[PDB]
Amino acid sequence: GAMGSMERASLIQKAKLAEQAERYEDMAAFMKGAVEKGEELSCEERNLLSVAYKNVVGGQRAAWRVLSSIEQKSNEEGSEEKGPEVREYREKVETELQGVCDTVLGLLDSHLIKEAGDAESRVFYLKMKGDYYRYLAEVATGDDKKRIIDSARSAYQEAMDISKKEMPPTNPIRLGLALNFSVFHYEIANSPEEAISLAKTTFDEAMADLHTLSEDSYKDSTLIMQLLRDNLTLWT
């Protein structure tokens, strides 16, 4: 509650400064503070929340992958025993990553999702819930791996159901949701055919709706469509 004494508007202002300074841990703490003021977030504020924690967890995920690769190489045949240090430090990074994911999921559960009535906010937060369960799933190995995966799947599915009912196929949130659910299928759920089908249907349905858009909206939608195409090119 270290941000409890700062005004909501000052927290948002400082989150934007932290972004300019590439101080994403600060940015996340400011936006957590803003969320804990208890008011719903605007579109811009939701983006700030997402940018901050995307960059924090992004650094942790990249570090975890470096360390996991070293750990796995240490457990091949002919590898010298180097002691517990690699495992220990990988566990340290993994625990910090899980703590960030838990923090985000806690904000969504208390009480961003329950107060989100509009499709754009509700889908945004449910996508975020899927994303941060997906990051937990990337590092999970024990008894709860399956339940973490199902938690991600359930959040993404509720978001998809709403987005398909309430949003046009070119909406960037809908597009980024489908992109990420497709990555979930490919990388987490061992369902590459589901991933490919989802990416292709999403891309084709957005293509057929581009004619309705302004030039600026067209640029926003085609940016995410190109990521879908990039993945299909990687996967096929």
Binding site: N47, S50, V51, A52, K54, N55, D131, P172, L175, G176, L177, L179, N180, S182, V183, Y186, E187, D220, L223, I224, L227, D230, N231, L234, W235
Partner: peptide, 7 residues
């Protein structure tokens, strides 16, 4: 794979 950027 690429996942979604922040807007």
């Amino acid at each position: 794979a690429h996942s979604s950027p922040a807007s």
